Amino acid sequence: GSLILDGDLLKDKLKLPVIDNLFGKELLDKFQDDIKDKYGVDTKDLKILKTSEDKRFYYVSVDAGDGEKCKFKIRKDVDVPKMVGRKCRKDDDDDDGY
């Protein structure tokens, strides 16, 4: 589940640079069940590069250990009660959503 923004009440998101990887580790820790359910991943191994977000989504760039550096796309609870996806694709992406 998400619970990270009940019905999109985003007033205070980020006014800083890259958010602490700890915060992303917390995301991935809480959404671990989703990430593991959907994809089957361990978030404890996930090496966070850049914890951030945009609007109704979180974006946690991590090294998956697989060589891929995916930017976990945690759709906030703005609409869905879970994380929607994960913006992977290191060098050149195309999909806006995921």
Task: Describe the protein in words.
By secondary structure, the protein is α+β, with helices and mostly antiparallel strands. It has one domain (1-98): Nuclear Transport Factor 2, Chain: A, CATH 3.10.450.260. The protein contains two helices and four strands, in the order H-H-E-E-E-E. It has helices at residues 21-30, 32-38, and strands at residues 47-53, 57-63, 69-75, 85-87. A four-stranded antiparallel beta sheet has the order 1-2-3-4, with helices on one face. Helix 1 packs across helix 2 (32-38). The longest helix has 10 residues, at 21-30. Disulfide bonds join 70-88. It comes from Engystomops pustulosus (Tungara frog).
Quick rundown:
It is classed as surfactant protein. The chain is of the alpha+beta class and 98 residues long.
Helix content: 10-25%
Largest sheet: 4 strands, antiparallel
Question: What gap, in angstroms, lies between the N and C termini?
Answer: 18 Å
Sheet-strand content, in percent, reads 15-25%
Number of strands: 4
- N-to-C SSE string, H for helix and E for strand: HHEEEE
Number of domains: 1
The backbone outline, from C-alpha atoms, is globular
- Neighbour order of strands in the largest sheet: 1-2-3-4
| Radius of gyration from the alpha-carbon trace, in angstroms | 12 Å
Question: What is the CATH architecture descriptor?
Answer: Roll
CATH class: Alpha Beta
- Could you please say which CATH topology applies here? Nuclear Transport Factor 2, Chain: A
Number of helices in the DSSP assignment: 2
Helix/strand/pairing category = alpha+beta
